[PDB]
Amino acid sequence: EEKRNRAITARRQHLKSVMLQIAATELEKEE
Amino acid sequence: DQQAEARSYLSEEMIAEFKAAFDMFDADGGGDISVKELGTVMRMLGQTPTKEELDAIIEEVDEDGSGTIDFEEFLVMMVRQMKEDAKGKSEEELAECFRIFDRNADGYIDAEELAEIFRASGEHVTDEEIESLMKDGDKNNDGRIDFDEFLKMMEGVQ
Ligand SMILES: [Ca+2]
């Protein structure tokens, strides 16, 4: 019940970490 | 007063979890907990202030000095701490991610642009996922997210 939301926030925090990578990666290829 | 802000700054599932821990140390059942329990409750929800920092906090929230704090007080503070403790990218680097994310360059990142992001990743982001990311990120509710809103959402992220 509250375990889910714990997971929900986790997954979300993770995706944001991914965003930063995708961005970073793409910013290097710009060379 | 300046509470609803702190409430807004936190997601739905966060305030839902924070309560859980809070309520946990609330025997009085009065939506109240002892300041001698703060440090430990804050530990359950990720925060790790140094004992000296926990003392500062206790001084701020409980100024009049009764030895307890409510949940709205917990919120307002938890949020400030979360922010203070932040250790994410700076403005400069975060703005560059932004322009990578804003394909049409309208000053926003929209639902569609959002899913356009995880495509470069080998992950599977559900429709709701995309919607929740935008949900917590969306604060004026314009349906999208601007830079300043992108900052908050990226606050101390690794
Ligand atoms: Ca855009």
Ligand SMILES: [Ca+2]
């Ligand atoms: Ca918005």
